With several copies, the nearest count.
Chain A
């Protein structure tokens, strides 16, 4: 009583989920220091 383990299990019934389904939510957090960028997309570096 008044002493509960603070964790619970979701479950995700196989097909009973309309808003009750596993949604593997990957989140990208884009961190820039105005430093050397390092992860940037496929641009062709033309001459200067």
Chain B
């Protein structure tokens, strides 16, 4: 399908919680349980925190959780810090021509 929909930029405060939306097609997110998110520290490599919508690799801080309903996937960051300021991309398998789709991305700026 087409690139997923993510907020352009979300700001907040440390320790406060911020949630990131990810909209796709029913063939991108709503037909599957395969949503995974990623983050960009500038000039660095990706890093996986989210996969299996709400499941986790070993070593990811319990501050990041993923959620799923309808066409909306969502990532929640509890107890924000300036440690958390990065870019964020949601990913999903698609039931169509392609196999993997990504969101436009979201820059989380810590104020």
Contacts and interface: CB of A to CB of B under 8 A. Distances in A.
Interface residues on B, range: under 10
Contacts, number: 3
Interface in B1-46: 32-33
Contacts of A9: 32
Contacts of A7: 33
A5 interface: yes
Main secondary structure of the interface of B (DSSP, over half): loop
Interface residues of A, number: 3
Interface string A1-42: 000010101000000000000000000000000000000000
Contacts of B33: 5, 7
B49 to A, nearest CB: 20
A14 to B, nearest CB: 13
Nearest to B93: A9
Nearest to B33: A5
Interface in B81-110: none
B5 to A, nearest CB: 22
Contacts of B32: 9
Nearest to A4: B33
3 contacts: A5-B33, A7-B33, A9-B32
Interface of B: 32-33
Shortest 3 CB-CB contacts between residues of A and residues of B: A5-B33, A9-B32, A7-B33
